[PDB]
Write a protein that binds this ligand. Structure first.
Ligand SMILES: Cc1cc2nc3c(=O)[nH]c(=O)nc-3n(C[C@H](O)[C@H](O)[C@H](O)COP(=O)(O)O)c2cc1C
Ligand SMILES: Cc1cc2nc3c(=O)[nH]c(=O)nc-3n(C[C@H](O)[C@H](O)[C@H](O)COP(=O)(O)O)c2cc1C
Ligand SMILES: N[C@@H](Cc1ccc(O)c(I)c1)C(=O)O
Ligand SMILES: N[C@@H](Cc1ccc(O)c(I)c1)C(=O)O
Ligand SMILES: [Cl-]
Ligand SMILES: [Cl-]
Ligand SMILES: [Cl-]
Ligand SMILES: [Cl-]
Ligand SMILES: [Cl-]
Ligand SMILES: [Cl-]
Lengths: 184, 184
């Protein structure tokens, strides 16, 4: 049942050392590629980063940006990150066997909406295949974009470390859906 | 496999009048609600429109805005709309038994990304239940927002007509997924 896949999927920020077969990632990209999109533009592009030096570069730029973010963060965001024990450290950016970078085509109508919709598909497909992921959004996308020679027509949306999950922390709660009818 | 569900799912712009059980629609919201989100804020909000008067108001406000849009659109979207023989009339906004209005909580971090990801889950769940949908995005959400007394805290992201498909048109093609390694 799809609800079972969705309910069981949780963030994974800690991965096994072993590298999953690329076929599993490709499968999940093929699932995502079946998603709808504005104008059927299919505005998602994928970059699979496996090179260890490059992952380390990405980790370093993101951690340097997170350090500044964590120094400055305030209020609700700070409290949430503190209560979940987040810090600027992002070891998974180096340790995950794959970094799946997801880009949107700037010129496509509803490109960013469509790519995030497709990311929904992608995440469920990774769960189906027994892989873990976290949608990681660093403070400064441009620095990561430059590291991988991103063309001007593309926009990095999210970094998805992918790998075999390793002793994940539990899924956070979900409040029940409360619907409204006709009008607020 | 999830791939088969994703491959099968296509736009539905032709609906039966027959009303699906509410639980079939609620199921899809329950699946979507299991999705990840920025800071686990669960920033989606659902408004189920069924009242025929209100559906008509929404339809006419959207059609007016579309008619102006179709008079003025140019470039690639105009070319695609023309070759698909799209027009500004939106009968599915009356014919669908449900208009599911999906909102994002503006104050939540990565609210829009998170809601569109959940919409990806939602569309797959609707397909699992044999329901059809189209992510309808009219040119002027503000007028629709006002019609349903949207609070200032929420942004209407998409109108999802939901119903039983009435022999919908075939799925459009998909280019092969575009996957690169390490750098562009
Ligand atoms: C973000 C987004 C916005 C969309 N907006 C509209 C819309 O305003 N009107 C419409 O008829 N279809 C809309 N669609 C549906 C697309 O036209 C459709 O997903 C695309 O043609 C692929 O259809 P297929 O899956 O049947 O091949 C939208 C889809 C997405 C993802
Ligand atoms: C748009 C978006 C951005 C996210 N950004 C980050 C991030 O920058 N760092 C991180 O650790 N997790 C990030 N997450 C993961 C969320 O914190 C996670 O989905 C949420 O805590 C719920 O986790 P659960 O499904 O395991 O309960 C992001 C999630 C989404 C949807
Ligand atoms: N909203 C208009 C035009 C339109 C149509 C399809 C589509 O994928 C996109 I993005 C826009 C209409 O519904 O006709
Ligand atoms: N990017 C920072 C903060 C962060 C964390 C979780 C999250 O859901 C969101 I949105 C932001 C970090 O990765 O620590
Ligand atoms: Cl997550
Ligand atoms: Cl097409
Ligand atoms: Cl669609
Ligand atoms: Cl939480
Ligand atoms: Cl917003
Ligand atoms: Cl149709």
């Amino acid at each position: 049942m799809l609800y079972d896949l969705a309910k069981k999927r949780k963030t994974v920020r800690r991965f096994k050392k072993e590298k999953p077969p690329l076929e599993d990632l490709i499968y999940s990209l093929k699932v995502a590629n079946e998603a709808p999109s504005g104008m059927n533009a299919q505005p998602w592009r994928f970059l699979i980063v496996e090179d260890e030096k490059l992952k380390g570069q990405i980790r370093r730029v993101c951690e340097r940006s997170e350090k500044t973010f964590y120094e400055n963060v305030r209020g609700r965001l700070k409290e949430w990150l503190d209560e979940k024990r987040f810090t600027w450290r992002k070891p998974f950016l180096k340790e995950a066997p794959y970094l799946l970078l997801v880009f949107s085509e700037k010129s496509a109508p509803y490109s960013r909406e469509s790519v995030w919709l497709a990311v929904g598909y992608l995440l469920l497909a990774l769960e189906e295949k027994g892989l873990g992921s976290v949608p990681y959004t660093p403070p400064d996308f441009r620095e990561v974009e430059k590291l991988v020679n991103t063309p001007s027509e593309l926009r990095l949306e999210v970094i998805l470390p992918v790998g075999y999950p390793d002793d994940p922390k539990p899924k956070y709660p979900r409040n029940e859906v409360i619907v409204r009818y006709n009008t607020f």
